[PDB]
Write a protein that binds this DNA or RNA. Structure first.
Lengths: 74, 74
DNA sequence: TTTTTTTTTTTTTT
């Protein structure tokens, strides 16, 4: 929506890689407008010049999600 | 975009819960237009009457993502 | 080869 949305990287979680479009797929915990810190997984430009839209994962989600996912690899 | 997008549930992976909006947060592998089967995490209506937008996770992503995330809870 | 959102969306043949 806005040209530059306010944010801040609280903690880097997982980094996957770039795609054919250069989409840097990563999962990091950032603060929404430098207020609420939460986990959000998105992909950005290869040159890190811009960002895109993905999905936000709350503690409730990440908790149950990781619990099951981690156990799925068992 | 469309009123009803074509799809098919190949395999259910993880089910989180509903939210204050009734958003049923789940992660299941479905076939895009009943063609390409891929993992996609989204939230639907409480009464499962409609669906919404989320994010699609490819094998490359889910693979590295799971590996790291699973190890993160170790 | 999307141009990111301070928690009641109406889903897309990579």
């Amino acid at each position: 929506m806005a040209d530059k949305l306010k944010f801040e990287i609280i903690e880097e979680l997982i980094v996957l890689s770039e795609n054919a479009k250069g989409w840097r797929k990563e999962l990091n915990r950032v603060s929404w407008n430098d207020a609420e810190p939460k986990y959000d997984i998105r992909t950005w430009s290869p040159d890190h010049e811009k960002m895109g839209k993905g999905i936000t994962l709350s503690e409730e989600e990440f908790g149950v999600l990781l619990k099951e996912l981690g156990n799925k690899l068992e």
